[PDB]
Amino acid sequence: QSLYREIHQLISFKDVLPDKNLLPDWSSNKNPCTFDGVTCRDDKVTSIDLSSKPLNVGFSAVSSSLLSLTGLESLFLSNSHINGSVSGFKCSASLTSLDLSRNSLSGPVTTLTSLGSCSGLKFLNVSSNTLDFPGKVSGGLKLNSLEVLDLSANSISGANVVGWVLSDGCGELKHLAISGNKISGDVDVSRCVNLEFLDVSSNNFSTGIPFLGDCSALQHLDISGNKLSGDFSRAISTCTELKLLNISSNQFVGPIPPLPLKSLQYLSLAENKFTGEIPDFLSGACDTLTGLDLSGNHFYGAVPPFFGSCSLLESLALSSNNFSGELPMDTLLKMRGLKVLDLSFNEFSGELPESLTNLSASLLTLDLSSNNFSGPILPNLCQNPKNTLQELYLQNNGFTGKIPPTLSNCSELVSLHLSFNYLSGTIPSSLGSLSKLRDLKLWLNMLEGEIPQELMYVKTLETLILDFNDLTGEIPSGLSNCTNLNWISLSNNRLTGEIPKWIGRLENLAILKLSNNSFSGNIPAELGDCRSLIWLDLNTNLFNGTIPAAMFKQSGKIAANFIAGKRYVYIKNDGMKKECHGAGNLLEFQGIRSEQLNRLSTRNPCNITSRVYGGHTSPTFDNNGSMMFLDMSYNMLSGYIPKEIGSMPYLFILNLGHNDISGSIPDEVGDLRGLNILDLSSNKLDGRIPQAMSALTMLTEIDLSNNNLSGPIPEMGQFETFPPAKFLNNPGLCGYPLPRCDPSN
Ligand SMILES: *[C@@H]1O[C@H](CO)[C@@H](O[C@@H]2O[C@H](CO)[C@@H](O[C@@H]3O[C@H](CO)[C@@H](O[C@@H]4O[C@H](CO)[C@@H](O)[C@H](O)[C@H]4NC(C)=O)[C@H](O)[C@H]3NC(C)=O)[C@H](O)[C@H]2NC(C)=O)[C@H](O)[C@H]1NC(C)=O
Ligand SMILES: *[C@@H]1O[C@H](CO)[C@@H](O[C@@H]2O[C@H](CO)[C@@H](O[C@@H]3O[C@H](CO)[C@@H](O)[C@H](O)[C@H]3NC(C)=O)[C@H](O)[C@H]2NC(C)=O)[C@H](O)[C@H]1NC(C)=O
Ligand SMILES: CC(C)[C@H](C)[C@@H](O)[C@H](O)[C@@H](C)[C@H]1CC[C@H]2[C@@H]3COC(=O)[C@H]4C[C@H](O)[C@H](O)C[C@]4(C)[C@H]3CC[C@]12C
Ligand SMILES: *[C@@H]1O[C@H](CO)[C@@H](O[C@@H]2O[C@H](CO)[C@@H](O)[C@H](O)[C@H]2NC(C)=O)[C@H](O)[C@H]1NC(C)=O
Ligand SMILES: *[C@@H]1O[C@H](CO)[C@@H](O[C@@H]2O[C@H](CO)[C@@H](O)[C@H](O)[C@H]2NC(C)=O)[C@H](O)[C@H]1NC(C)=O
Ligand SMILES: *[C@@H]1O[C@H](CO)[C@@H](O[C@@H]2O[C@H](CO)[C@@H](O)[C@H](O)[C@H]2NC(C)=O)[C@H](O)[C@H]1NC(C)=O
Ligand SMILES: *[C@@H]1O[C@H](CO)[C@@H](O)[C@H](O)[C@H]1NC(C)=O
Ligand SMILES: *[C@@H]1O[C@H](CO)[C@@H](O)[C@H](O)[C@H]1NC(C)=O
Ligand SMILES: *[C@@H]1O[C@H](CO)[C@@H](O)[C@H](O)[C@H]1NC(C)=O
DSSP states (O other): OOHHHHHHHHHHHHTTOSOTTSSTTOOTTSOGGGSTTEEEETTEEEEEEOTTSOOOEEHHHHHHHTTTOTTOOEEEOTTSOEEEOOOOOOOOTTOOEEEOOSSEEEEEGGGGGGGGGOTTOOEEEOOSSEEEOOSSOOSOOOOTTOSEEEOOSSOOEEETHHHHHHTTOOTTOOEEEOOSSEEESOOBOTTOTTOOEEEOOSSOOOSOOOBOTTOOSOOEEEOOSSOOOSOHHHHTTTOSSOOEEEOOSSOOEESOOOOOOTTOOEEEOOSSEEEESOOOOSOTTOTTOSEEEOOSSEEEEOOOGGGGGOTTOOEEEOOSSEEEEEOOHHHHTTOTTOOEEEOOSSEEEEOOOTTHHHHTTTOSEEEOOSSEEEEEOOTTTTOSTTOOOOEEEOOSSEEEEEOOGGGGGOTTOOEEEOOSSEEESOOOGGGGGOTTOOEEEOOSSOOOSOOOGGGGGOTTOOEEEOOSSOOOSOOOGGGGGOTTOOEEEOOSSOOOSOOOGGGGGOTTOOEEEOOSSOOEEEOOGGGGGOTTOOEEEOOSSEEESBOOGGGGTTTTOBOOSTTOSOEEEEEEOOSOOTTOOSSEEEEEOTTOOGGGGGGGGGTOOSOTTSOEEEEEOOOSOSSSBOOOEEEOOSSOOBSOOOGGGGGOTTOOEEEOOSSOOOSOOOGGGGGOTTOOEEEOOSSOOEEOOOGGGGGOOOOSEEEOOSSEEEEEOOSSSSGGGSOGGGGOSOTEEESTTSOOOOSOO
């Protein structure tokens, strides 16, 4: 191991990097031990770590230069843009750990057999690459000295790949992870007598449960995200050291089988098809449970008192079943260290007991959404000065009375969701002292009064959802201090005044929904300063003046990352009812049941049986996008449509119906290639429909009726596919589907 070879090898590797900007301090002028990413012991290189650097070289360059360094013990190249395939090479006997995860390695997984020349190799990570397995699986990986092997998240599809991995022996193996592939067939680790960690999740297993044999060392077993059913209980009967069992997202059925494995600390049976009331399936002492998840099955009945033995439980998840009865305090109060209580989507009922306040001392998350609780929200929920509560989810129940202003004592609160209840009174101003609050959701209640100026103190505020209350007054200027606002929804209240000019300062603002209020004045040009605005719904107000060209100036520069990943529903207007306005309502929908959407019937004249679209927000671009949804219908807008309207390639819906807009449809409307819905009806538009609109190919709905348009309807494009109704009440308009233009009228 001469310095001469060491330095020439390191530098010869640097000299083949495409980006000259890489490894700026490696030099034949410096000692290797001074290089960034190099670790030495007694002035000799022992480890190299170039992970998260865009090397952009082939594995052969890596194996030629770095893996043959005498005395090298570890090599970390995770997320280094290494591509190509591994093949035979000379490897130093000192090398114990190789991390090649998160690259673009490709070829048959049989290529990894070449690593057999690393005689000391004990740890191999090749997760997140594109390795695969031909057709028929034969021979074996033959790396039987590995203690740790991670082949996760590759492109391995095939039956019995696991046997292939283990074929030449697995006496040394402690940790095997191969999740995130498409492997099927048998898993037999019965000869892996030292195996402590097995992860075969997110694969394609649909037959036998893994055979574990003696199961003498196993502590962690994850078979989640497959299509397994059958007798998992019998398969782990011998497992005396098991601490974590994850069988969630599979096809298991029947009642919960006994699992009195006393060592068990984490257990998930979530998203299967288990049925019944909970039988006592644990030891007298609740095994050693810190974590329990029974979510997404068909359980019903009361939460059994034997759960009172789980005094170490930190996380209890029972959501999306059919549990009933009143909150089980006697049981829950025995869980002195409970951090997460998730009972959402069940049929718990009755009022909140005062003892619930004893529980909220360790509680980070209290989730009671979508049940049948009633009575008032507890006033003293956060009495204790050492309270840690971060999430309070009470939405979609039957709570009455006021929002307790003492919720301001929940100083660590991050998300407050009280939507879908029957709360009255005002939004307490003390909420402004929640210095970590990010989400304030109170929609569909009977709240009155004004939106509190004191919200200006919540610099962390990202979501403000207040639709369907009885709020009055104007948008308070204090909101301008909430510079991280992403989603503002104030629709269906009785708010007044203007859209303030400071709205343009809100650079994170993605969704602004103000529909069905009494807002007035002009549309501010400052909306064109909002860097993230993708959804603007202003329908059914009293806005007037002309649509300002500047409001479209951010087109092509829109960012849409922050808004992503949130549950919503979109309720489409079917057009059948005159009282129902706008293209459709986009609404927040975390923890609420669609079945309860009928609760809108007293607020909303729209046929509930109208189409409900749902999911998690997912913009079509990440950056350099444009507005996606613009609805300014049922106002008193006048003047002309600016040509800038056509500058939004991601605009799916444009609704300017029922205003007093005049002049003609701009040719640039034909530039809106993503357009599905164009509603310009009940205005005063004149002139011809531009032929340029023939270029639009994605239209599913158009409406130009009730204007003063004239001349022929364009022959090309989608016009001919729409009913005459979409063009009626335009005296000068002619051509299919209208009567043919006839010069002599
Ligand atoms: C903007 O917001 C305002 C304020 O919310 C909103 O006005 C309200 O609209 C709703 C829906 O039209 C009205 O609903 C009242 O209450 C019920 C709703 O279920 C209805 O009465 C019965 O309804 C049931 C269910 O549909 C039906 O089976 C039954 O036949 C109805 N009873 C009758 C008359 O036979 C009525 O819709 C109505 N009831 C009353 C008070 O007669 C609210 O009354 C409205 N609240 C007001 C005006 O203060 C308005 O629509 C929103 N605007 C837009 C464009 O969305
Ligand atoms: C093989 O390499 C994989 C890719 O690096 C490893 O998978 C990653 O392990 C990371 C370290 O545990 C995880 O770190 C995440 O982000 C931070 C890191 O400091 C943690 O706080 C987070 O808790 C953790 N994840 C989250 C958000 O909870 C990576 O998430 C994880 N996954 C990927 C695909 O990157 C394997 O661990 C490694 N195999 C072995 C056996 O070591
Ligand atoms: C970017 C987010 C804010 C947004 C909620 C996003 O997650 C969501 O997928 C958006 C893009 C969806 C939600 C509802 C969708 C619309 C649902 O309403 C409809 O009228 C359909 C009719 C027809 O299927 C059209 O092809 C699309 C169209 C008109 C959809 C266009 C795309 C959406 C507007
Ligand atoms: C996951 O496994 C299933 C079940 O083995 C695969 O479906 C089979 O695929 C083979 C090969 O094309 C067919 O011959 C069988 O008829 C399929 N069986 C059934 C019941 O449909 C499926 O291909 C696998 N998924 C992936 C992504 O590899
Ligand atoms: C138990 O397994 C489930 C399901 O596989 C885990 O949840 C998934 O985690 C993976 C990443 O490993 C994600 O890709 C999935 O989106 C998750 N699915 C669901 C439905 O949440 C869960 O994390 C595991 N629990 C523990 C403690 O290990
Ligand atoms: C727009 O709504 C407002 C509030 O009712 C009104 O603002 C008037 O605008 C016109 C033209 O700018 C002028 O009469 C005055 O500048 C404003 N006077 C009032 C009443 O405040 C106006 O009625 C509406 N019309 C327009 C086109 O602005
Ligand atoms: C590996 O990356 C380089 C650089 O982009 C490329 O030239 C080469 O073709 C890649 N190899 C494979 C097999 O894709
Ligand atoms: C759910 O449980 C409740 C207990 O109150 C019962 O009345 C109801 O019929 C059950 N619903 C379903 C879908 O099984
Ligand atoms: C909010 O906006 C301005 C600063 O630009 C000022 O009125 C005020 O000090 C800011 N912060 C608070 C807490 O009001």
